[PDB]
Amino acid sequence: RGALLLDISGVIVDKPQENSLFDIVNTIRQAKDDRNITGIVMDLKNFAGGDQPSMQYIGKALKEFRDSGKPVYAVGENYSQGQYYLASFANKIWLSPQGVVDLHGFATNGLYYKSLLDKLKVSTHVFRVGTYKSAVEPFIRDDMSPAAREADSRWIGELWQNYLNTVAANRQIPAEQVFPGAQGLLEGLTKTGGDTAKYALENKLVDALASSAEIEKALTKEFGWSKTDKNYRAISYYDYALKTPADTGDSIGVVFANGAIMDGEETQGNVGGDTTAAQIRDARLDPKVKAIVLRVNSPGGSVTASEVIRAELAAARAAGKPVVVSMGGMAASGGYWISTPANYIVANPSTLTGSIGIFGVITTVENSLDSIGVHTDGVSTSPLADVSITRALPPEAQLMMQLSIENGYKRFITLVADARHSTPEQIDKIAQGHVWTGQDAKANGLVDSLGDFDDAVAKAAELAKVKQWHLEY
Amino acid sequence: RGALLLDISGVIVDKPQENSLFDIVNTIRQAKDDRNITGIVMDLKNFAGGDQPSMQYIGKALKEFRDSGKPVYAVGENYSQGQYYLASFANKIWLSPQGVVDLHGFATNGLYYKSLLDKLKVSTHVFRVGTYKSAVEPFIRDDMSPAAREADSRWIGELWQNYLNTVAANRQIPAEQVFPGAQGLLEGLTKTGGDTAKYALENKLVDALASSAEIEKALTKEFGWSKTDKNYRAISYYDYALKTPADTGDSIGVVFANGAIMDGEETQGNVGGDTTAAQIRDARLDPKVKAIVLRVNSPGGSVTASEVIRAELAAARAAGKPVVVSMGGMAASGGYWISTPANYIVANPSTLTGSIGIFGVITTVENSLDSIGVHTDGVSTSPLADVSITRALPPEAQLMMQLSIENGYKRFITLVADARHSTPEQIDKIAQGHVWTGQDAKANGLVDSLGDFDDAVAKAAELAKVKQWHLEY
Amino acid sequence: SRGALLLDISGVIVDKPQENSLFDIVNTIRQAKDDRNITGIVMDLKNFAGGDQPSMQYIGKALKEFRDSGKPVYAVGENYSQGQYYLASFANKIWLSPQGVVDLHGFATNGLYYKSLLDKLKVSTHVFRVGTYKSAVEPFIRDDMSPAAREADSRWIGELWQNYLNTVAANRQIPAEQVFPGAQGLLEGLTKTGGDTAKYALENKLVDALASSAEIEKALTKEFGWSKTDKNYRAISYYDYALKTPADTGDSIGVVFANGAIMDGEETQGNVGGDTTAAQIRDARLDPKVKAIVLRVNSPGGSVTASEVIRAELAAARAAGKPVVVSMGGMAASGGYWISTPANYIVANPSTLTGSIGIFGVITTVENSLDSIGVHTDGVSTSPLADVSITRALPPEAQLMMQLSIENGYKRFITLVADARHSTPEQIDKIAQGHVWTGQDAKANGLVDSLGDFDDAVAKAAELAKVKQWHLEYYV
Amino acid sequence: ASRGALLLDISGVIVDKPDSQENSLFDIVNTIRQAKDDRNITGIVMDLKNFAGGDQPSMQYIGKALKEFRDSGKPVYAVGENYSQGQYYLASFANKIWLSPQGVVDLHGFATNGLYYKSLLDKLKVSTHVFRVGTYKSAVEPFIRDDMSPAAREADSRWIGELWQNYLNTVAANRQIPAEQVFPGAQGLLEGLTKTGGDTAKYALENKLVDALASSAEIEKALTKEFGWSKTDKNYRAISYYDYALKTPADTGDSIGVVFANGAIMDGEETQGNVGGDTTAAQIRDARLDPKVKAIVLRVNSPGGSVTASEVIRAELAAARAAGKPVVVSMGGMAASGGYWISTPANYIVANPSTLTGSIGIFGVITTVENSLDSIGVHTDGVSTSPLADVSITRALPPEAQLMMQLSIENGYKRFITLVADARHSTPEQIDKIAQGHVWTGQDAKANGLVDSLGDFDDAVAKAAELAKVKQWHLEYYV
C-alpha cells in the first residue's frame, strides 16, 4: 500500500540540510518489516553527501531491506559521486538518457601560507610532537612534507579503493570497470561519441536510461497509482512516522561527540568539552543506563576539553558501567584521546582515526607592526606577562611551551599504552601524529574491531546483559 | 460615473512596484465595457517601464478601449522614453510647459575584463559552442567580437525601429519626425532656445502644454468633479474591482516561465525547474485543463533545469494536451529550449529569442594566490578529482568539460531540429549562439507566428475546442 | 502652578520635525507671557545644539516680549557654546560657572575640494553651469575656492557675524568689540585673568554673576520659591508645559513648510518632496476655509523640476484668489528662492540666506579609471544619446544637449524672477549669476520685499484679505 | 539535610555596579557574610572556571569575606581543572585547593602594554598637537613617542612593581609559603618545570600551590563526603550563589547614601558602562536633600575623564558636605585624575593599598590631517570671521587657537593643584611636587597626603557612620 521514497535533502550527520544517520537507518529497518511499504525509491537530487562510513551504514540497512525481498530503486537525471555511492545499493538504477555518472576520485587539498606570513613579517611559533602531525604545515611551509604526503596518500588511496570495491560488489562488476582512470574513462567515452549515459549503461554502472515521466511509468507499474496524489503510491522519508521504541526500563546511553572539541558549553556544530562530560556523567549516575556508547565523529581539537571528556568516561567505566566507542567517519587526535578509556573500540574501515600527536601555534606581529611604524611598550614584573600578539614571544615562554608540548605527547602515548595493553615505545611507532584508516588502526592495535554502530551497541549489551533500549543524548 | 486612472507605479512584469501585465490589459478591457468608466487617464510619473512587447500589448488594449469611442488621455511633467511609448497610445497628450519627452534611442552596455583578470593573474577557461554566444565574452576579450557586434546590432536596430514605427503610427507623424537623430534634435532644439516643451508641441510629440492645475481643470471639465474627492471623477487602477471570470468547466492553463532558469525551486525573481515542472504536471493531469500556454520571459539558465521543464511539457503533449508558447519579452537559450516541445510558438516581433548555444566558465586563482605567497597542496586519486577554485584545472578535467559542452550543443541543435521539422546541419546554420528578434525567428522557422498572448491563447483553444477560461499557475 | 517656565531645550531648533519646533517654543513663551501662573523664565541650554540665526532671533523676540511684560528671564549654565549664548544673551540676567567659558570664536565656512584626487583616479568630470558664483560645483573642478566664490562667501559670512555681534551687543548693552575683541584682544584679555575664562566673562560683562549649580539653585528658589514635592525651585519644563489649542474662528491662513533640500518624489528623510508639498499647497487651494497661504521656506534648493512643481501649485492658489506670502527662515536659496517667486510678498530675516539665482549639473565618468585597472565597456546603440553611463565616456552629442538645457534653465529662472519682481531678465542677471545674498542684500536689490520674520508674513497674509484668522499648519 | 555548600560558581567579571557578564562586588561580599551566619550553609566551594577577573582591591575585599567565613569554622574549598592568575588569587583564600592531575596554576606577573605610533602618524603625514601639564601624564605619549619616556617608565614601574608584590604577599600569606615560592620568577618556573618534565600539576603540588590533584569525578566524591549527597539534585548538597536568596536588610530611617562613580567620566547623563557628570551629580543631589540620608559615601572606580563633568560632580559633593552631611570616599581599583578630582571634597578618603590614584595632571590632544589629504590631492577651503573659528580635523590648527588651548591647559592645571591643596591642607607649590600627572598606589597616596587611610568599603562605611551617628542602613542609588 506504498513505497518509501528516500528523497533525502541535504547531508547525513551524526546529530542535527542536516539528516540523522540513525533515523534513516532506523526508518529503513522499520519499513522492511512494514506491510504498508512495498519497496524503496531513492531520489538523490538534493542529497549533498555524507561520510563514507555513514553512507556504508545506510548501505547496510538498504541491503537488509533488499534481502527481505522488497525491491530498491535508484532514480535521477544525473549522479554525483557521493550520490552514486548511496545509489549503488539499489536493485535497479535508472539514469536519464542524456544524464551522467560523475565519478572522479578523491582529492585532499589544503592552503599553505609560510610565504604570506614572512611577507607580512609575522612571527610564527610552532610547538609540536609528531612527524606526521601536518595540520601545522600551513604555518611553516609552502607545500606538504614528504612525510605528510606518505600519510595522506595512504589513507586517500585506501578510502578510494574502498569506494570502488563497495561499488564494484554492489554492481557485480570489477572495480576498474566502475572507474578505469582518466585515460580509460576518456577512451571509453570516445567509443561512445561522448555519450555519458551510453558509457554508463554499456559498462554496467547503470540499469536503464529513461525520461523522468517514462520512469514515472515503470514506477506506477510496480507500486500502483494514487489518485489522491496523482502519482505512484508512495510516502517520503520526511513524512513516514518512525515509531517510538518501547521503554524496557534498562538501557544503553548514547553520547555524541560530533565535530570539533572546544572548551566551553557546546556551541555551533562542535563538541563542548563541558556539555559532553555532563551527558556522560548523567549516564553514570542514572541507575537505568547500564552501558555507554560514546559515538565519535570528530577531527580532534582542544586537549583539555578532551581530558575533561575522557575523565568522565573513565569514571563511568570505573563505576562498573561498560563504555564502547563507535567511530564513524573520524575519531582522530583528540577524537582518539576521548576514545581511550573504552572497553572496546570499533571503527569503519574508512574511518580516519589515530593522529596521536600534539601541537600549538603562536603568532605575533611585533615586526609587522614595526614596519608600518607601530610599536609597543610597557612595564612588566615578569617576561611571562609580556605574552600578547603585539609583543615578541619571550624565550622563557618559548622554552616552557616546548616542555609543555613534550609533556603532552608523553601523556598521550601513555594513555594509549595503558588503554591498548601496549608499551609507550610501541605506541610511539604508530603515533607521531600519523592518521590511520580504521583498517590500519585495527592492524596496529589502536582499534579492537571493524564494524559499525550495530557492532558497538551489540558489544555494549554483551559487556552487561539482556533486552535493551537506547537513550540518546 | 468616472475615469480609469492608470497611475502605474513600478514595472510591468509577466507575473509578480511590480504590476501584472495581464491584470492591466484585462482591467482596461473590462473598463471598455463598463458604463461607469467614461475614459482612461494615464499618469505615468512613478512608472519605471516594461519591455517593448508587453507595453505594446498594453497599447492594444488602449486602442480597443479607444475604439469604443471612450477617450484616453496621457498627462505628466515629463516623459521618459519608456513612459512616452505607452502614452503615445493616447488620444491626447498633455505636457507641462517646461517638460521634456526624452527620446534618445536604445543601447546595450557591458563591462569587459580580460586585462583585469590578466593583471590579477586569474586563469580563465571558457568552454563553448557558438560564435555568437557573446555573454561569455567579458572573460576573454576587452571589447566585443566582430561576430557579437553583428548579432547585437541586428536585433537592436530592429527593436528601435519597431519603437519608432509604433510611435510614428500612434502620433500620425513620420518616424524621422518622432526622432530625427542626434543631429536633427540639436537643430530643432536650437530653433527653440532649448525649450524642449515647445519642441514637443511643434513636432507633434505632444498635443498641449499646461501645468498640473490647468490639466486638472480640463480633466474635470471632461469627467466632472467629485465634491467628495475634491478632484475630477476617477478611480485608480489599484482600487478598481477587476471581476474574476466565471468558471466554465474547460480550462486553458497558463504557466509562467518568468526569469532566469535555476535548478532549485522558485527563488528570488528566478524560475525554479522543479516548481515549473510541477505546475506543468498539475495542469497535464487535471482533467479540466484542455491545453497549456507556457508564457515565457526568460534569458535562459541551467540546461538541466531546462530539461526538467521540457520533459514535462513534452509529457503533456504526448498525453493529448495542446501546448502553446507565448514569448513575451525574452525567450532565449534555455528560454528557447523549454519552448521546443510546443505545437505552436508565437513571438512579438520585438521578442528576443534564439541564442541556440552553450557555454561554461571556470576560473582558478592559483597564480593569483601564488603572487601573495599563498599556495595549495594535496594528494589526489585522479587528476579528475583535483578541481577547485585555488588549483590549476587539470588537462584531463578540461577535456571532459569540452566534451560535455560539445555535446550539450548536439543535444540542443537536435531538439530544435526535431521540434522545428529540420535537420542538425540546417539548425547549426542559424544557431551557433546568435540571438534573433521574434521576426528573424519567424523568418528562419524557429517561431511559428508573430503575435501576443491573445494569439497564443487563441491557438490553444483552437487546437482543442470551444468555450474557455484561464487557470493560472 | 505659580512658578518659572523652564526652557531646558534639548537638541536643535527646526521649522518641522532632539528636534524642536521653532513655532512651538515661541508660542509657548508667548502663552507663558499672559499666563498668571508663570512668573518667570529659566533658560537651561546645556543640551542645546543650535538653530539658524534667524530662528534664534525669532525666539529672542518672544523672550523680549516676555521681559517687557515685567516677568524676569534668567540664563543658567556651566558654560555657553556660541549658539547657546546667543539665546542666553536675551536674558535679564545670565549666571555662569566660576570656572566656565563663554565660547565666542566667530563664524566659518569650510569645504573639501577634490580636483586632484579625481585627476589622480583618472575620473572624467563634467560641469554644466550658468553662474560665476554658483559655487557648489567647485569641489569637482578646483583644489580650492574661486576668487569669486570667496567674495560672495565673505560678504554673507562677514555679515551674519556682524549681526550676531550686534544682536548680542545690544542684548548685553556693551560695544560689539567688547562682546568679541578679535583673537589678539581675546588672548590679551584672557592672559590678564591668568586664563580664567569665567572672570574674563564677568569682568567684560558677557555674564552677570558667577555661581555653582547649587548657589544658582539657591538664587532661583529665593525668586520662584521651593517645591516640597519636586524638591526644586518651582518650575515646569517646556516639554511638560501645556500648549493651549488655538480656537478656530472659521477663516484660516494655511501654513506650508518647504523645509530642507527639494527632491522629486514624496517627502522622505528630512527633505522636501516636490509632490508632497504641492499636494499640500493644492489642498489649501481648495479648502474654502483657508483664505491665504504662508509658505515657510528653509531650503538650499534641490531639483529644478520639483521646484517648478511646487511653484506651479503656488501660482495656481494665487490665480485662485488666495494671496501667497513667503516667509524665509535661515535659507531660501536657489530652488528655494524659485519656489518663492509666485508670492504676492516675500519676507526674509536680515540673516536669511537667499538668492543664489543660478543653475548647474554634474557628470562624472570613469572610463579612464577603469581602463587603467584593465576594465572596459563595449556595446551597440541606435544613437550616441543613448550611451550615457557612469562607466562610459560622455558623448559630444549628450554634452551639447546638456549645455543647452542648463542655459535654457538659467533663462527660465531669471525670467520667472523678472516677472515676479517687476524687473527684466537683464536686470535680474546683474544680481543672479549664482550669487547668494543675505536677507539684507535681497532687500536692497529687490529679490525680497521686506525684512522681518514669521509674524510679519502672517500679518501680511491676513492683510491681503480680512479681520480674524487662526493657523492651519499643514504638518500633514 | 537541606543544609549544603554555597557554590561560588561565579561567571564573568567582578564590578562595583552591574550595568544592564557582570557581578556586583557587594552582593558577593554580602552573600558570604549572610552565608557565614546561616545554619543552612555548611561551607563554600569556589568553582571559578568561567570567572574572568576583577581588580585587585575588589578581589581582596571578597577574600576578606571569605576569611571571616573560614574563621567561623566553616570550610572553604576551591576546585578547577585550571587556574588563571586572577582565578588563583581568589582560589588561594580557600582552606583547600584541588587541581586536575595535569592542570596548571598560571602565574606570570603583571604587565602594562600600550601602542605607540608617532612613526605611523609621520608616515601618514598627520599633524599632532599635544597640550599638557604633567611629566608623568603619560597617556599622551602614544601620539608623540614610539615607546615610553623614562619618566613614564619610572612611574609605571613603581606602581606595577608594587601591586604585584601585593599579589604575591597576599597569596603567599594565604598559602603559608614564602613569596618566592609562589612565583620564583621566570627562571624559577623554568627550573621547576624542567625538573618536572613539563608537568604543571606536579610542579604546583610539589611547591604547595595546590593541595590535591583530582579529576572532576574524584573531587565530587570528596565534596559529597563533606556536604552529603542530594538524592534529589543528584550532586553533593549545594546551592549556587545565583540562587541564594540574599536577604535585604531591615530598614531603619537613618541611612548612609551610596553613590557609584564607576567608569570613565563623561559629560552627559549616564551612558554605556560610563559615569555621566549629570547623573552622578543628581544622585549626589537626592542624597543632599533626603532627610533620611545622614551621610554619603562616594564609591569610586575611575581612571578619570571629562574636566567639566568632574567639576559638576565635585561641586554637588561640596554642596552635600556643606549642607551638613559628611562625605566619605571609598576608592576601589582606580580613582585617578578626574577620579581624584571628584574625591577632593570629602571628609575622609579611604583607599586599597593596591588602588591606583593620584595622576593629578591635565591634557588634550588635537590631530589634524591637512597634509594627509594634501597628498592624496584633497584640500579644504572656506572663509572665516576669525582664525578661532577655523578649527576642524581637515584644517591646520591656527596659531591663535593653539595659544588658547595652551592657556586653557595651564589654567585647568592650576585649578587642579589648587583644588587639591585646599582639600588636603597643603599648598599649590607643595602639591606640585607630587602631581605632575604622577599616578600613585593607595599606599603611596597615604604616604603623601592624598589619601587619609588604607582600607576597604567596610572602612568607608564605618567612618561615615562615625561622622554622624547610631545604627544605620544603606541606600544604594542604582538603576
Tab-separated table of N, CA, C and O in Angstrom, chain D residues 40 170 203 229 233 241 260 271 277 357 371 377 379 383 389 419 421 427:
chain	number	residue	atom	x	y	z
D	40	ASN	N	22.186	26.907	57.524
D	40	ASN	CA	21.954	26.012	56.391
D	40	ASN	C	23.062	25.951	55.367
D	40	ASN	O	22.999	25.145	54.452
D	170	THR	N	49.844	38.506	49.412
D	170	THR	CA	48.544	38.052	49.849
D	170	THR	C	48.490	36.546	49.642
D	170	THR	O	48.006	35.800	50.475
D	203	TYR	N	54.476	20.222	39.494
D	203	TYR	CA	55.156	21.442	39.952
D	203	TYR	C	54.284	22.182	40.974
D	203	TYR	O	54.771	22.621	42.010
D	229	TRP	N	25.063	13.814	50.048
D	229	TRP	CA	24.518	13.633	48.686
D	229	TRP	C	23.050	14.021	48.548
D	229	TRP	O	22.214	13.467	49.228
D	233	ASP	N	18.981	16.266	43.951
D	233	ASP	CA	19.698	17.064	42.907
D	233	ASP	C	20.714	16.256	42.094
D	233	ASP	O	21.304	16.765	41.132
D	241	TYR	N	25.422	30.537	44.280
D	241	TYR	CA	25.357	31.975	44.537
D	241	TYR	C	24.197	32.654	43.809
D	241	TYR	O	23.513	33.513	44.391
D	260	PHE	N	27.778	55.558	43.212
D	260	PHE	CA	28.806	54.872	42.425
D	260	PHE	C	29.343	55.674	41.278
D	260	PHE	O	28.618	55.934	40.318
D	271	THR	N	25.879	57.073	30.323
D	271	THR	CA	25.845	56.331	29.072
D	271	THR	C	26.601	54.991	29.224
D	271	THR	O	27.260	54.792	30.233
D	277	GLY	N	28.537	62.952	34.226
D	277	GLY	CA	28.548	64.089	35.169
D	277	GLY	C	27.207	64.373	35.819
D	277	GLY	O	27.099	64.401	37.038
D	357	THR	N	45.612	55.729	41.903
D	357	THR	CA	45.023	57.019	42.198
D	357	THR	C	46.078	58.078	41.873
D	357	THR	O	47.044	57.816	41.100
D	371	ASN	N	47.779	67.711	5.790
D	371	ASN	CA	48.853	67.183	4.938
D	371	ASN	C	48.650	65.742	4.402
D	371	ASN	O	49.281	65.363	3.409
D	377	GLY	N	45.765	64.507	-2.933
D	377	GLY	CA	45.076	65.579	-3.633
D	377	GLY	C	43.676	65.963	-3.162
D	377	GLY	O	42.819	66.313	-4.001
D	379	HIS	N	41.702	68.782	-0.453
D	379	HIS	CA	42.025	70.064	0.215
D	379	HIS	C	40.814	70.690	0.871
D	379	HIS	O	39.657	70.280	0.635
D	383	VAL	N	35.880	80.418	4.238
D	383	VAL	CA	36.148	81.744	4.796
D	383	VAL	C	35.766	81.772	6.283
D	383	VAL	O	34.953	80.933	6.749
D	389	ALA	N	37.661	80.329	14.660
D	389	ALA	CA	36.530	79.535	14.199
D	389	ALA	C	36.916	78.484	13.140
D	389	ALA	O	36.078	77.778	12.613
D	419	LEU	N	42.575	73.028	43.905
D	419	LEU	CA	41.515	72.210	44.473
D	419	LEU	C	42.106	71.264	45.491
D	419	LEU	O	41.537	71.049	46.568
D	421	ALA	N	45.200	71.191	46.995
D	421	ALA	CA	45.863	71.864	48.117
D	421	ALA	C	44.905	72.419	49.176
D	421	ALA	O	45.220	72.370	50.368
D	427	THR	N	49.722	73.293	50.075
D	427	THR	CA	49.800	74.435	49.162
D	427	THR	C	49.981	74.018	47.696
D	427	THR	O	50.441	72.891	47.430
